[PDB]
Symmetry: C3
């Protein structure tokens, strides 16, 4: 199978500059070369160049609406392409607001996809419920069908079409949810595994249930949107919104190893890696290294080891 | 329901000065204000003023017997009072020796209560088995009924009446138990989940079993006496007796979230927080912050989020 | 029962000097004295003096073959001896290549023994599959019966006799396996629990299955060969090959506590402790301290506590 790396060095989805440097840091770490060592064919599409919308006045509270809306429109164009050629898209973030265009483009080709959102947040704030106008915490609001018309149209997002419903998404790792977001997920009945469910069940049983929930009836493509703050700050410290008591390095790898095993991975997002937020160079090395390790586990790298088929090592 | 914070800035239960500053640190951190944001009604009773017993000569090995005995007599007068008005008592420690008066007063109003003791120690050393005369490691000895008359009467504790039996208590997080204490718990058959049981079972199944053990037959009020060294030193470093290999931040919160769900929390003790033992300001912040987080989870704060009833956020 | 400490300050099994200092570090930490406090009789045999083979030319890729082969021939002589007097052998490493003579000598006296290998690696590289000629990553290749004649005879190892079969060994903690090694374990069908199985099952269920697998039919002596990099670098940083995402301090102790419980521990290897690889004195302290804690805990020290029999502490 083919893999296409897509760099989305974008940061207007939030106030902390630095996430744009994410793709570079991940490539600098040898992400592309390491992937080629796997059984997949790898093609690096390079980094997208995002045109900055001048005079991007805030829409009520929402900041940089047009810049974000445009960058995502361009990204969804690119993704919907690579998918068309039947390749697996891998988007290197920049902030999680780019999930809008990554999933949108993906859905255009595979309308029956389901999503597994690993994060410490929901990001289902609507332009009306955000305490801050930051879009990185609003991605899912723009995508769901149920939240259609429940908030005013935003400048630059008119091209967006709610592609997935509340039944097609599952959250894993939640631990920092605003009152508004919590109201939303409870009301729409969205399936989620907050850290307390993970503690109660064990990452093993959690993956078992997310699969039977999303793939029980129909086998469909899976879009894994991974926010790096999904794991505890001890493993991925260089992010903008670190929350204590998250997913361990082991639980994170377990999740990607399983998803690999389903053989249904299609889209993948490695978001929020911010190289400039590391207190020491080591914190940054730590962060990037796990991110790379996750990506790698999504495409086959097993902890138990790997050996090339047809090769008699004896 | 009503909540009553009661500060017990006491430290004579052990040699390291500093725990008396615990209540201040917890309030300074915004404990009371944060609680008011919960569905409970909060009333701060302030800090108790403990009269120092002059010429408090040690009883054999036991140090400051009268001072400790008196401070506890006063604290269980206060607790028995608030419980009488049907409010939930929350005691902010100093040292764990104050559990004597916290549980004594509580038992006066609710004689059928059961205890969940989170800690790395048992604190069931009797005045005859302690290697040190420190009372903070002897609380439970004075409470249980089975250990009645198995040790000489101590100066200042004649007011104490063994209120709970070996069947009404469960330990969680044990990892540093003296030979004597281990003899006692084995002999009296006290239910406990040391770190090895937690490793074997997983915090989820441990809470399941403590509940069926203590509430299987009769539903009764629960008194959660939380020693902050119950968690690993990496989360709560500012304590007097830190032991490595303890409960994680996640496991600690899991235990309080569950207890909240039983709807039977009646008394709570947040003990051993010593602000002066933090090697760096951050260590102290870390400690205080999770202590507050635990208290908050006992009264509803869920990791999956919270939303106010009857409020349509859309 | 009798215990015999045997120091193997050897390091030619790998390129990083320092592991020879392991035994001293462990003794300096009070390992022997602390053991005497247990119910076992302890005898320190001292450190073996290994004669250096001059002009030890590499065999193809394999480095220091003769020096390593000889040191192990001497070690297996010593071990086979103490076992013959019915005492439990405890080998303090240098590098894990010494497992060859530790297990060989042990098997001479107890041919029906089974092995529990805790490590992040397999070390089942054969002289033909190693990418580096380092022997510390080839121990198991020389011991297995199934891998007999699958590789050229190496200078100095002609005294070795494959003592255990693929059915007598279980790995726990794997997370860094070369393609060749992975081919080998899959082909020979060796039972293992990599970090993903530990995540899926929980250390509790893992130990349950390794026992039923190795002791289900016949109760036989157990040789625990512990590689200190088996735990995560956060607990045992001072090693030559640290791999992230390993066994926690708690899981490591759980494993030794269970093995003690079987009452079948016969041989024990505490390998790879390298005092010179600690970035700070604390890292080295940390490492040695848990190594000592594991050894203790192999011989009875329980987290729930210990009390001497027949002693009425009341
Ligand atoms: Mn996030
Ligand atoms: Mn996110
Ligand atoms: Mn304690
Ligand atoms: Mn305590
Ligand atoms: Mn190893
Ligand atoms: Mn090894």
């Amino acid at each position: 199978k083919p893999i296409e790396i897509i760099g989305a060095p974008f940061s207007k989805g939030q106030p902390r500059g630095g996430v744009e440097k994410g793709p570079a840091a991940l490539r600098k770490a040898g992400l592309v070369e390491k992937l080629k060592e796997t059984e997949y064919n790898v093609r690096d599409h390079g980094d997208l160049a995002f045109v900055d919308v001048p005079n991007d006045s805030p829409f009520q509270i929402v900041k940089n609406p047009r810049s974000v809306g445009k960058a995502n429109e361009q990204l969804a164009a690119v993704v919907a392409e690579t998918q068309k050629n039947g390749t697996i898209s891998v988007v290197l973030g920049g902030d999680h607001s780019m999930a809008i265009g990554s999933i949108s483009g993906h859905a255009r080709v595979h309308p029956d996809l389901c999503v597994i959102w690993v994060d410490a947040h929901t990001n289902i704030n609507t332009p009306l419920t955000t305490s801050s106008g930051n879009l990185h915490g609003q991605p899912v609001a723009f995508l769901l069908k149920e939240l259609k018309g429940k908030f005013p149209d935003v400048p630059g997002f008119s091209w967006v079409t709610p592609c997935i419903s509340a039944k097609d998404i599952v959250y894993i790792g939640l631990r920092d949810v605003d009152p508004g977001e919590h109201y939303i997920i409870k009301t729409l009945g969205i399936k989620y595994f907050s850290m307390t469910e993970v503690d109660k069940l064990g990452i093993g049983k959690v993956m078992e249930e997310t699969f039977s929930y999303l793939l029980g009836r129909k086998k469909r493509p899976i879009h894994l949107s991974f926010d790096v703050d999904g794991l505890d700050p001890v493993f991925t410290p260089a992010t903008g919104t670190p929350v204590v008591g998250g997913l361990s390095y082991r639980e994170g790898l377990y999740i990607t190893e399983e998803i690999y095993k389903t053989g249904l991975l299609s889209g993948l997002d490695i978001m929020e890696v911010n190289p400039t937020l590391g207190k020491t160079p080591e914190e940054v090395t730590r962060t990037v290294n796990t991110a790379v390790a996750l990506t790698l586990s999504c495409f086959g790298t097993k902890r138990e080891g790997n050996h090339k088929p047809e090769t008699d090592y004896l």
